[PDB]
């Protein structure tokens, strides 16, 4: 989509692996605001918005909190307290055509700066003076959308760049999107330090004869201590035997 008419995609009710985005070597710009580039697989959010637009190489730095610019004022504004990551890479081989590509437009003239996360798609003739335009272009009446005219022979700053903006928002509501931490292979009959979905502990994992209900995950003994657990990957009930200990 165009920069003035950027599309917004809602991402929820799925698992996301952000490690493949960092370890790809195809993105020219990879900077995260508020959070670290790493450790994104241990975070959970209620919803994620995905905004995409095409700009030139010089306007890439304009999408940042606390920064100004044409794009920042009249095309796409980020708040000062924005958290998330911005993805951008060169797209000269896909968005440029011989003789100039006019499919991408940008908003240039506006009375006031945009409020953060605003999408303006108005095609009203901009009134540059005290004389009304009445839908007729001319003196003091300029069309708000202009053509980029991308060409394959254009310089680095003039080459088209595809920019994807990731928005991270949280709320008291349950997190619908979460990241998958690596799960090592299960080991049996050894004193190991284990961790599961809700609890951590140290013990010996042995096969059980218990019959958990299909929805149950954890087991408890009489005096409020854990004795059995269900593996989150394999439907096997594993007893937690405490490791051998005693006084000397």
């Amino acid at each position: 989509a165009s920069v003035y008419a950027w599309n917004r995609k809602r991402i929820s009710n799925c698992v996301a692996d952000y490690s493949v985005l960092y370890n790809s070597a195809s993105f020219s710009t990879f900077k995260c605001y508020g959070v670290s580039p790493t450790k994104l697989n241990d975070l959970c959010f209620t919803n994620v918005y995905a905004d995409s637009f095409v700009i030139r190489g010089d306007e890439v730095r304009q999408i940042a909190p606390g920064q100004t610019g044409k794009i920042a004022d009249y095309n796409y504004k980020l708040p000062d307290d924005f958290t998330g990551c911005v993805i951008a890479w060169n797209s000269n081989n896909l968005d440029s055509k011989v003789g100039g590509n006019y499919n991408y437009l940008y908003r240039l003239f506006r009375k006031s700066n945009l409020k953060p996360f605003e999408r303006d798609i108005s095609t009203e003739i901009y009134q540059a003076g005290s004389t009304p335009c009445n839908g007729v272009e001319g003196f003091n009446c300029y069309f708000p959308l202009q053509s980029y005219g991308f060409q394959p022979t254009n310089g680095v700053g003039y080459q088209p760049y595809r920019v994807v903006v990731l928005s991270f928002e949280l709320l008291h509501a349950p997190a619908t999107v979460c990241g998958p931490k690596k799960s090592t292979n299960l080991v049996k009959n050894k004193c190991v330090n284990f961790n599961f979905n809700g609890l951590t502990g140290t013990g010996v994992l042995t096969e059980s004869n218990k019959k958990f209900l299909p929805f149950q995950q954890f087991g408890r003994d009489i005096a409020d201590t854990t004795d059995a657990v269900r593996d989150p990957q394999t439907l096997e009930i594993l007893d937690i035997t405490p490791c051998s200990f005693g006084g000397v």
Epitope: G100, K111, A128, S130, G149, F150, N154, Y158
Partner: antibody
Framework: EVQLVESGGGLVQPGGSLRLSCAAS????????MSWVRQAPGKGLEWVSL???????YYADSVKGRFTISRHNSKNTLYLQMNSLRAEDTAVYYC????????WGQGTLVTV | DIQMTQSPSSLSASVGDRVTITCQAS??????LNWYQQKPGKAPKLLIY???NLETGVPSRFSGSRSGTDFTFTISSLQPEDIATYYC?????????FGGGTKVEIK
């Protein structure tokens, strides 16, 4: 109908300050891109600064920390405040419109 | 800063002669270039905007023809009242760049 008039030029010692004015008629200053462009004698034309319609301000690399642009709403006059003038800043300053048409004042003389 | 140099520095031509100058850019600009005419003692005047369109009030004898990265100005008929300094200024890049100037005289 449409005409840009400039005033405020004069002889200023180095290290001093000055303020220029650019009154407009026939159009709205705040809804259009304004710029201050100077021209030193004996050489070519040189851009200095621009201001956006929303209030964003930028300046040339030679005038970081020294030049200031502003605008008074009621009388529709564009101003350029400069501080700590140098010998190379002696130029004939103009106020113009960035896009859709080019409108030029009569010019004023600033000598340092 | 963008590198931009005009060529040639100065030339002389008679009335009605064919005058052709070129504007050289190190970085490729798609169509963002304007031409200006600075009379002696007077401000420059815009003639061609976006390097392909005629400004209202400008005579048709002035035209801009894109030649890849460089852009060339076209004068069909030179007149003694056309003595001015020629500038090409690239736009959409900060700092905005105005060239050294090209002087055309009447011989």
């Amino acid at each position: 109908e449409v005409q840009l008039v400039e005033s405020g030029g004069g002889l200023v010692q180095p290290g001093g300050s000055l303020r220029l004015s650019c009154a407009a008629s026939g159009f709205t200053v705040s809804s259009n891109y304004m710029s201050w462009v100077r021209q030193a004698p004996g050489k070519g034309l040189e851009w200095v600064s621009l201001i956006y319609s929303g209030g964003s301000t930028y300046y040339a690399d030679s005038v970081k920390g020294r030049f200031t642009i502003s605008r008074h709403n009621s009388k529709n006059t564009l101003y350029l405040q400069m501080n700590s003038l140098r010998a190379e800043d002696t130029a004939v300053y103009y106020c113009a419109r960035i896009y859709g048409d080019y409108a030029w004042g009569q010019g004023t003389l600033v000598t340092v | 800063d963008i590198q931009m140099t005009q060529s040639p520095s100065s030339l002389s031509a008679s009335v009605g002669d064919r005058v052709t100058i070129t504007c050289q850019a190190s970085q490729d600009i798609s169509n963002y270039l304007n031409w200006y005419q600075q009379k002696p003692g007077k401000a420059p005047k815009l003639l061609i905007y976006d390097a392909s369109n005629l400004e209202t009030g400008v005579p048709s004898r002035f035209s801009g023809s894109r030649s890849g990265t460089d852009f060339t100005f076209t004068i069909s008929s030179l007149q003694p009242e056309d003595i001015a300094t020629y500038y090409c200024h690239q736009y959409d890049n900060l700092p905005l760049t105005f060239g050294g100037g090209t002087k055309v005289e009447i011989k």
